[PDB]
Symmetry: C3
Subunit: 327 residues, 3 copies
Amino acid sequence: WTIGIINRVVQLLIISYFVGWVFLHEKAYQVRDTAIESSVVTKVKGSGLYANRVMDVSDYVTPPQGTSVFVIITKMIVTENQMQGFCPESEEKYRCVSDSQCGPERLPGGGILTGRCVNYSSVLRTCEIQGWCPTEVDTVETPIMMEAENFTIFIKNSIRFPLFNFEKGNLLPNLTARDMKTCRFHPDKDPFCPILRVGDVVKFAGQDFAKLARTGGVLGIKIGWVCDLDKAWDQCIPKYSFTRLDSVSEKSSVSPGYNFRFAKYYKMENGSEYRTLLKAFGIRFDVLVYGNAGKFNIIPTIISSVAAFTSVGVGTVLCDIILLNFL
Amino acid sequence: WTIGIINRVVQLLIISYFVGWVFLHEKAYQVRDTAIESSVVTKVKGSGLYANRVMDVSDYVTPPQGTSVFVIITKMIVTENQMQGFCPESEEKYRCVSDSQCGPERLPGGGILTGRCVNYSSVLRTCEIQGWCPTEVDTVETPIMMEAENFTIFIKNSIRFPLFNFEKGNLLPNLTARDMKTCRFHPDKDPFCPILRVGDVVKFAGQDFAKLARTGGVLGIKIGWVCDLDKAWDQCIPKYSFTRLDSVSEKSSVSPGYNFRFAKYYKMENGSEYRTLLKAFGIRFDVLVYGNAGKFNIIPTIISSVAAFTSVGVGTVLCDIILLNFL
Amino acid sequence: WTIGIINRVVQLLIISYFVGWVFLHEKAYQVRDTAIESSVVTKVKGSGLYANRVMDVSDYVTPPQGTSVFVIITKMIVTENQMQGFCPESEEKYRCVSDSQCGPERLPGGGILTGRCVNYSSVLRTCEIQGWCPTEVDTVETPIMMEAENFTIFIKNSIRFPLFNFEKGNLLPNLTARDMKTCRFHPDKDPFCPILRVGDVVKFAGQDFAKLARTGGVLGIKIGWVCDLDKAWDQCIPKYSFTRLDSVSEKSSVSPGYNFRFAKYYKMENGSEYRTLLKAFGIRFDVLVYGNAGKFNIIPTIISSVAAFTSVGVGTVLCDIILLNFL
Ligand SMILES: O=C(O)c1cc(C(=O)O)c(C(=O)N(Cc2cccc(Oc3ccccc3)c2)[C@H]2CCCc3ccccc32)cc1C(=O)O
Ligand SMILES: O=C(O)c1cc(C(=O)O)c(C(=O)N(Cc2cccc(Oc3ccccc3)c2)[C@H]2CCCc3ccccc32)cc1C(=O)O
Ligand SMILES: O=C(O)c1cc(C(=O)O)c(C(=O)N(Cc2cccc(Oc3ccccc3)c2)[C@H]2CCCc3ccccc32)cc1C(=O)O
Ligand SMILES: *[C@@H]1O[C@H](CO)[C@@H](O)[C@H](O)[C@H]1NC(C)=O
Ligand SMILES: *[C@@H]1O[C@H](CO)[C@@H](O)[C@H](O)[C@H]1NC(C)=O
Ligand SMILES: *[C@@H]1O[C@H](CO)[C@@H](O)[C@H](O)[C@H]1NC(C)=O
Ligand SMILES: *[C@@H]1O[C@H](CO)[C@@H](O)[C@H](O)[C@H]1NC(C)=O
Ligand SMILES: *[C@@H]1O[C@H](CO)[C@@H](O)[C@H](O)[C@H]1NC(C)=O
Ligand SMILES: *[C@@H]1O[C@H](CO)[C@@H](O)[C@H](O)[C@H]1NC(C)=O
Ligand SMILES: [Mg+2]
Ligand SMILES: [Mg+2]
Ligand SMILES: [Mg+2]
Ligand code: NA
């Protein structure tokens, strides 16, 4: 009967349409390179006020070279003119009643204990230690540099898909409005401007600059390069996203934020050495460049072809059995 | 007829040969690991002359630890003995006629304006600012360290393909001529020497050391590990390429080169603080290690097998139809 | 005969079982993301004694920001109060007999030779050089900071599989015993504690802290994220491994270890500049985060399906031919 081939022909048409759209949707004919090779060069701009001092890029940005991970210092704690010697630790955890509890068995991983129980103040008695004196007092409250909200981060990103030798950059004057220096990045109004406002980045990550500057934190400027190298060279475009990386988990057991210690080493006219100990709180920025490209290839196209051919050939039989049975 | 099977047998032989060479060429029987895990340790060697001073590795290399990204400083601008205070900015962009145009609305992202219009010199009148005084003069011309062309970069690279747990290194004494310390890297005469001459790297990237040292730049020493783990362990070999990463695009809108600012912080005998502000131009080197290995696997070999089997089975039918029709 | 279909049915059952277990074992139905996107934040804790000085985290850890690569300085060589000038190099390789062998042709890549042959001591005569004087004496023996064995490394690692947008962290209070701060990492007793003991890390890598601290070295804290995103979110877990990265190859031709030079720059009350030159030996730690996830996908499941269908269909024929023939 002719209808039998009109039922099968319709069967093959329809079933082949489902399979066809599926394989075409997932780019099953494409080999994929997911090992992007990126270089990131950053430039921070701005000036702030801390105490009665003025901070410029040389004072609060560390490191200076413009790497993919850098820190904008917003708050710090200074302990000036330290010098090697003996002094009572100011940490309460080092409280003692007699020299019998200031032995090596106590706080093994901590500082160097001299073995004497001394009076830091009239209200506390702590183990004496050898090291930089006086000791640090990290329980005080200090101001935060608010101007850092208006600082700008300029990100130059140069990536390359090696499997295809397809290299491109994120400096695109055509995609962003002229006076490029004057652009700033908005996810909607200017999603291709390489200049990021610090406060903006803090907002895009859903973070309060006050609490963040107070406790410090780690933010990530994410550059994504999902590209179809079958389309125009013009179509491979970077997409920026933002996130806070220092988990604020309720379970915690650890204080949130981000801070680190460094000293400025001075030597005396008399030749003795003394440093300024600095506890720095700021916003570390990690530029994380992900990307994967897909290019047509003969091998994946043949495998997907055979897959769809055989799969349809079975689906038509199964559909014929389902029909003849009628249920 | 016997010829019918001699035509089909020849058909199957030939068609199967096309498919066979294609799948065998693309290593369709191989699973691929494109997530190389590399460690890079670098060592720079050399000494230069700048002004009437001698620069050693401790003076021009930053950072010192020998990471995958480092900078060889070739030119710098010094502003010595700065101290917090008030002074007229030297940038022309800060020109003013009266204190009415030195308000917060002007240059919001710039320095801290005091609000006074002062006379930097007799020919210019600029807004006064609070910060490190005197201000920087980044419009002067300074020499460049030419000896940096003869510096050598030693790159230790240790990579690992985790999917196969196949780890190897780029220090290969057998592939490079003895007196290894005396080797230097030429793409043809010594393509496995880990010692790179700075000037050589500048040449391999097609760059002029004069202009590059003058304006600074970003070069990439690329280590590629394309390997067939089906062949001998001896065959997985690294291949070095070179490129300049700071786009010099005509569209530009940004000054090419690479520079960053850092200060040397001194404290006075009287206790006041003062720094030396340094604008550094140099050549940043980014070691970019790409790699992908292919090892025989049962799953990809079966999928490719089925693919070629079915594909030939259809190609022979299509070729039979093309022949019987004769066109 | 009915037995013919009982032989074929058993044939299809058995053969289909081999193929089925194979494809199910290799997760052939899974698409794989091998481009993990990780952020690493490290914190070192401890204090040591070197000479009659006390070293804290600000003195021996470099860089300070807590990156994925950092160095714990264990031994160092100090050359104090250097100043630009002329002096005889102390390296024996610079031995001379007359000013005729101190020309530019000698040691082209080395220091700046003045051209004079001078007497460093009564037993050696070396070329004079311009640079930081006095010169460094890197042939002396210095102590090593032993307390560094008891230091602790705290590693915060935040990764993300972008293909699935599946992000997770390595701070897992449920997997590690409470008093999290008090945990320390043992591969068996506490394989999820983020706090690493320096000495432990040195042991897990099969290295002697004595020789390592003496010569310096490069260790890698490896975080592996092999995950089946088909299983519970709870099952994607990090696994830590350890390795020494500075090859100690017998062929060598290079001194093992790891060291770098940096200076502390001082300026004189009289205004002249002088530095302290420091050769630092320590243990560099490189946090290397690998990972690959597998999630069920329609495309790979269909391709593997067709593969097994066709492959079984041929295996049954081949097995029938092998049986009928009987050999
Ligand atoms: O100044 C301080 O007093 C200070 C206090 C702390 C603290 O939290 O107690 C810290 C700190 O963050 N850690 C890390 C830490 C904290 C809590 C829990 C931790 O373990 C887990 C958390 C969650 C999930 C799984 C495990 C890890 C310390 C704790 C112990 C060991 C140790 C070693 C090295 C470095 C730091 C720290 C740092 C400092 C400092 O700057 O010197
Ligand atoms: O010392 C200086 O005077 C100085 C000048 C410039 C400058 O080019 O104008 C710069 C500089 O490079 N940028 C970056 C920049 C420049 C031009 C165009 C830009 O945008 C695009 C370019 C091409 C394609 C798409 C976008 C981005 C500045 C410009 C604005 C904002 C801003 C913020 C942070 C950092 C730097 C800069 C730096 C400095 C400095 O060292 O302090
Ligand atoms: O203080 C020193 O005197 C000193 C000595 C050496 C040394 O080994 O001779 C070194 C050093 O490690 N290298 C690297 C090096 C050594 C041996 C063989 C090498 O080549 C291969 C090894 C194995 C396989 C394939 C190649 C590479 C030097 C050697 C030459 C060039 C050069 C350039 C830059 C930097 C360092 C070095 C450093 C210093 C220093 O800190 O200043
Ligand atoms: C580490 O600390 C323990 C005390 O917990 C001490 O017994 C041991 O000697 C220390 N290790 C070193 C190398 O000093
Ligand atoms: C250097 O002077 C300071 C105070 O000015 C003094 O405390 C110190 O002991 C002196 N140095 C030495 C080595 O005595
Ligand atoms: C940022 O600059 C604008 C002027 O453009 C100013 O109104 C605003 O107060 C500044 N932000 C902060 C936090 O000072
Ligand atoms: C320290 O001395 C300098 C000049 O020698 C002087 O300008 C400065 O005001 C002094 N410090 C203080 C706090 O006055
Ligand atoms: C590099 O060294 C050679 C001697 O080997 C010398 O002739 C040449 O001038 C040096 N290059 C520069 C730029 O000084
Ligand atoms: C500064 O003083 C030192 C010794 O105190 C002296 O050697 C040096 O020459 C002086 N500076 C200048 C520029 O003369
Ligand atoms: Mg403390
Ligand atoms: Mg300026
Ligand atoms: Mg030497
Ligand atoms: Na297939």
